[PDB]
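Forwarding the complex inputs:
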Amino acid sequence: LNDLLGYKNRKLYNKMFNFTLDSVLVARFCNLNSKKKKICDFGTNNAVIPLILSKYTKAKIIGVEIQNKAVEIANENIKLNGLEDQIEIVHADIKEFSKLHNQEFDLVVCNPPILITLEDIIKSASRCLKNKGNFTIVHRSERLSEIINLFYKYNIYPKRLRLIQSKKTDNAKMILLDGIYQGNEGMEILPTLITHNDDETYTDELLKYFHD
Amino acid sequence: LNDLLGYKNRKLYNKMFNFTLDSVLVARFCNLNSKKKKICDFGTNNAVIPLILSKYTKAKIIGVEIQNKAVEIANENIKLNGLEDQIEIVHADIKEFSKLHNQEFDLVVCNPPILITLEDIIKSASRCLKNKGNFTIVHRSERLSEIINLFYKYNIYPKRLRLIQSKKTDNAKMILLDGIYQGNEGMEILPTLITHNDDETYTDELLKYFHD
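Prediction (whole assembly, two chains):
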C-alpha cells in the first residue's frame, strides 16, 4: 500500500517501474476533451491508467483484462480509491470484447504487456471506436512504422506522435501515438520527451507527469 | 560566388536558406557506406546535395532535374568544383527517368521543392533501386505517416527516422527518413535534432553540419 507517485488522492497495492512509467506517460498523453464520454483501456497496468485518467475527466472507463489475477488487483485498486462507479474492470479477451462493444467508445487506450497480436489490438480498437474516435497507444520505437501501417489498414489516421528518449544523445526507445478512426490525413509531432539529464537524474519535463 | 557554408573546397553561385538547410541536412543524413557505389538525387538543390555527398564518398551521383534553368545552375556549380566526372545532371522527368533506369542505384535521395506527386516520388524511387537499396527523403512532419504508408505500398521498409525541431519546446517541423527496398521490418529512431537554442542562436548540434 503506497501513494501513486505524487498524484493526490490515489493509492495502490510491484512489476517494472519503467512499465508503470510508460503507463503513467500514455495516460497523461491521452486527449481528454469534453467529447470523451466513454473510454476503453485494453491493458490497464493494475488500473494505473484508469486511476490517472480519472483525475482529469469524469468519463466512464471500462478496463479490459484477460488474466484473472490482474482483474483482481485492478478491482482492488479501484475500490481502494472509491472509483468503482466511474471505472469498471471486465475480464475478457480483447478480440471478443470489441465484437460485443462495436462503435461504443470515444477513446481506446492501450499499453501492451489466446494470442493477442499487435494487429489484433489495432483491429479491435477500430471495432470499439465510434466515428471520429481516438485510439492511443504506447509502444517500442522499433515498431513505429508497422503500427502506422496497421492504423491505416483499419482506417485509423495517425494524428499525434511523441518520442521518448532516455538521454538527449540516445535513440528514442518508446513512442506515444494516437489516431482518429475514419478521420483525416495530417500528423502533429510533439516535442521529444527526454526522461533523464546527463547525470542520470530525471528531467523536470518528465517529473511534471509524476503528479497532478 | 560564395563558399558553401564552411565546407572545404566547395563553392557555388539564392533561394530560401531553410531550403538549403534541409538539403544540407538530408545529404549529411544519408547512409554512405561502401555498398553505395551509385547514387541518384531526385531533386538536387542547385547540386548542393551532390556537392555535400561528394565530400564523403567517390560514388557516382546522377542528379535528376525537370526544369531547364535548374539543370544549368547545377551543372555550373558542379564544373566550378571540378566534379563533373563524379556528378552528372540529367534533365528528365522523375517518372520517365526511373522507368529507363530500373534497378540501377544503391541510394536514391529526395528533397522535394508534368505533376510529380509524393506517391510518384516514392514509386519512382522503388523502380530505381536495386534489391536492398536505400531511399532517403526529407519532408514536412505533417506527412510522416502518409510517407511511411507509401514506403510500404512499394515494398520500401522504413529504417531510420530523425525529427528536426526548431526549439526544444516546438513541434517537429521536418523529418529525415530512409528505408530499404525489399528489406526487413524494424525502425531506428535517432536523437531529435534541435536547430536553435532558446535565445534564437543555432545549436552546436546543427552547426556540426555546416562544415566537413
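The domain at 2-208 of chain A is CATH 3.40.50.150 (Rossmann fold).
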